[PDB]
């Protein structure tokens, strides 16, 4: 099957372009055409839905007229024209707001019409290259096909950010290249495909199949209807008397098509349920540690791990696990495989629910007897030497704290009595300063090292362990200015602070990233880069107005001990990607290998419409969201399980094509 060489490098290079032009599409709509947000999201979703529903207009026009490999060429040409009318509609010089809109919309329309009709037909054509005697090697071809698709997706994710940023196309931000590169690579794929015209095994279409199928099914739904008569409406099956016409060599084919269609009924719900992890799992990742000690991993980037697992399990599965199954009588009939894929998907969402139930158990470390939690913050310009001691210079704590930084650690200062007037030993700039802050046991305390001109002093702050509500954090502030401030993170209440090292009161603000907060003093208004604020974490911010560096806020955090890392989410990624690989590849092969020779691509159309109806269900359901995450995952697991049982029962009775 050497001629499949120019079938996989084409799918790679066109999925690459499609995923590249999808990611930048929303940014282009919002920031170039300057469209309203609801209009932009609406048109983007409409374009995706059109991409998903058009495969019928490709499969029918392949298996009825014009054949295929003459639909691939003559439809990828329209696809190229669509990319041209897109990249031409991003030119910022000629025309404005009417040309730029007309070309863009025509480009979306033609690109959708191309992709939805290249996607099924290319896989069907790749299948046809093989011989029925070599029925086994087709499975590896479809595995390689899916590998190429997800490799394209992966490379698009890694390389599209390097296109839409800081280029000049003509006097403004550069979106033509962000569209030109996908178009250029796709038209360079249309030339690698056409090179194989001397190599393929082009099957001529056998007849006006979709016309024949529709006419046959209509006549079928006419014979049983014997209103005031009848003795043999349609006996032993529901087509067997749609056979007085339409010779039987076709009636078997339409029977097979109907049986596979009846089998594919439950699947769209599964596609919707599996889809609802691209965003909700990211919300899960937002609420957990991610530094990893090697590379601080942003929660958004976690997504790219999904295609990577496909690239690492496809050659793992198809070359290890499937053979290891074949060691004995275990008979995967390419339907048990899809059922077990469904089962692993359900197990994956159950594991996600378990992870949720574990995350909501964060508590910051409570104190037992003779235990106070301390956390020293330094603001002296140089470096300071921190020591805490007892009655007689008796060891309680030694620690060298550096200059301006943040801090998240602490230390379990083993106190000694009901209350110990702590002797602090701070040494800085070769100075000896010792003050006493009487403290109560089993609490949390913080120090501020501040520049008292030549010398320094220690300020003690006692935290009251007011925990914040679920999925939300609490903050308090320390002021170092000469005037009282007002830092209103929240909507209604203007939080206030005090001058000359004052203390604020705890405020409970929504978790997230706060880049700038209103801060009005007696005279001046400004803002500060508070940055990220994880939930279940008590933050303390010190506001400084140092002469050299201006207004900057020095972080100081509490911490939940049992904060699970960004790991422990790979297991649910592993179990969902195993489901995806065991399901998609097997579905492609099953659709191709259980289809009559005259309609080899309408089954691919049925599979793609399954995915499309799944997307439509995703769209309709996603708006009706009012449930907690853990309950959401347990419901998505129970529903997926019942769908799996429905599919298993409806597959145990599916007679195979022969």
């Amino acid at each position, epitope marked *: 099957p050497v001629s499949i060489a120019f079938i996989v490098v084409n799918e790679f290079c066109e999925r690459f372009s499609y995923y590249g032009m999808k990611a930048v599409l929303t940014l282009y709509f919002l920031y170039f055409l300057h469209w309203n*947000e609801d209009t932009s999201t609406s048109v983007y979703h409409a374009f995706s839905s059109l991409c998903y529903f058009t495969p019928i207009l490709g499969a029918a026009i392949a298996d009825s007229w014009l054949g295929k490999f003459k639909t691939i060429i003559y439809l990828s040409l329209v696809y190229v024209l669509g990319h041209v009318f897109k990249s031409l509609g991003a030119i910022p010089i000629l025309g404005g*707001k009417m040309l730029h809109t007309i070309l863009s919309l025509v480009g979306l329309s033609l690109i959708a019409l191309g992709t939805g009709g290249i996607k099924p037909c290319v896989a069907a054509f790749g299948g046809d290259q093989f011989e029925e005697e070599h029925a086994e090697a087709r499975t590896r071809y479809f595995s390689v096909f899916y590998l190429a698709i997800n490799a394209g997706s992966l490379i698009s994710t890694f390389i599209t950010p390097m296109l839409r940023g800081d280029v000049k196309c003509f006097g403004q931000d550069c979106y033509a290249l962000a569209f030109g590169v996908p178009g250029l690579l796709m038209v360079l794929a249309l030339v690698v495909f056409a090179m194989g015209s001397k190599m393929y095994r082009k099957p001529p279409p056998e007849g006006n199949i979709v016309a024949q199928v529709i006419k046959c099914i209509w006549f079928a739904l006419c014979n049983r209807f014997r209103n005031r008569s009848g003795d043999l409406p349609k006996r032993q099956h529901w087509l067997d008397w749609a056979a007085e016409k339409y010779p039987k060599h076709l009636i078997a084919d339409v029977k097979a098509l109907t049986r596979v269609l009846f089998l594919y009924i439950p699947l769209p719900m599964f596609w919707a349920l599996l889809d609802q992890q691209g965003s909700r799992w990211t919300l899960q990742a937002n609420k957990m540690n991610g530094d990893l000690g090697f590379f601080v991993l942003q929660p958004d980037q976690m997504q790219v791990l999904n295609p990577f697992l496909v690239l690492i399990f496809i050659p793992l599965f198809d070359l290890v696990i499937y053979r290891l199954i074949s060691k004995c009588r275990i008979n995967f009939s390419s339907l048990r495989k899809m059922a077990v894929g469904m089962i692993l998907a359900c197990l994956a969402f159950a594991v996600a629910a378990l992870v949720e139930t574990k995350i909501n158990g964060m508590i910051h470390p409570q104190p037992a007897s003779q235990e106070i939690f301390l956390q020293v913050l330094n603001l002296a310009d140089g470096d300071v030497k921190v020591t805490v001691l007892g009655s007689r210079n008796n060891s309680l704590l030694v620690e060298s704290v550096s200059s301006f930084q943040n801090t998240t650690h602490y230390s379990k200062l083993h106190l000694e009595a009901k209350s110990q007037d702590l002797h602090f030993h701070l040494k800085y700039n070769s100075l000896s300063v010792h003050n006493d802050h009487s403290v109560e046991e089993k609490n949390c305390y913080q120090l501020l090292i501040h520049q008292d001109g030549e010398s320094i002093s220690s300020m003690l702050v006692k935290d009251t362990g007011i925990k914040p509500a679920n999925g939300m954090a609490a903050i308090r502030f320390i002021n170092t200015l000469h005037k009282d401030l007002n830092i209103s993170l929240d*909507t209604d209440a203007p939080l206030s602070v005090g001058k000359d090292y004052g203390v604020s009161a705890y405020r409970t603000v929504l978790r997230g990233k706060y880049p700038a907060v209103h801060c009005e003093t007696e005279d001046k208004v400004f803002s500060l880069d508070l940055g990220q604020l994880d939930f279940g974490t008590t933050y303390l911010f010190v506001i400084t107005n140092i002469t050299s560096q201006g207004l900057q806020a020095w972080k100081a955090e509490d911490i939940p001990v049992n904060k699970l890392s960004i790991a422990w989410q790979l297991p649910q990624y592993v179990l969902v990607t195993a489901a995806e690989v065991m399901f998609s590849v097997t579905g492609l092969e099953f659709s191709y290998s259980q289809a009559p020779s005259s309609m080899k691509s309408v089954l691919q159309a049925a599979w793609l419409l399954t995915v499309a109806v799944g997307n439509i269900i995703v769209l309709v359901v996603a708006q009706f969201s009012g449930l907690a995450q853990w309950a959401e995952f347990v419901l998505f697991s129970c529903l997926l399980l019942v769908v799996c049982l429905i599919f298993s029962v409806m597959a145990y009775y599916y007679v195979p094509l022969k």
Partner: nanobody
Amino acid sequence: QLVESGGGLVQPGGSLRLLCVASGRPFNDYDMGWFRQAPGKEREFVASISWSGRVTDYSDSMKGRCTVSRDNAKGTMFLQMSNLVPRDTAVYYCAAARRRWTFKATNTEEFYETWGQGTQVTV
């Protein structure tokens, strides 16, 4: 609808926060934008925040730094300039537009329908 406005004089290098409340209808259903008008013959788009505040866009100038935000509760929108200079002494207008399906640009004096009075921020 019936929008309002609050803000004032500045030092040559200070900053401000502009406030705009909705006085007669649910502020959630309103796309929102900021305009200026120098004491000349212009009407410059300044910044724009979309419904739910999820998408924000700033003009090419966006003097120093600007940040728009909105809380659909209490129905108010916040503009925060950073580096006001002796330019942009203008009459900053606050503009609103209902959530329709239109292809009109979000950064023009055409999409917004009901801009109210404006402050007289000087520098």
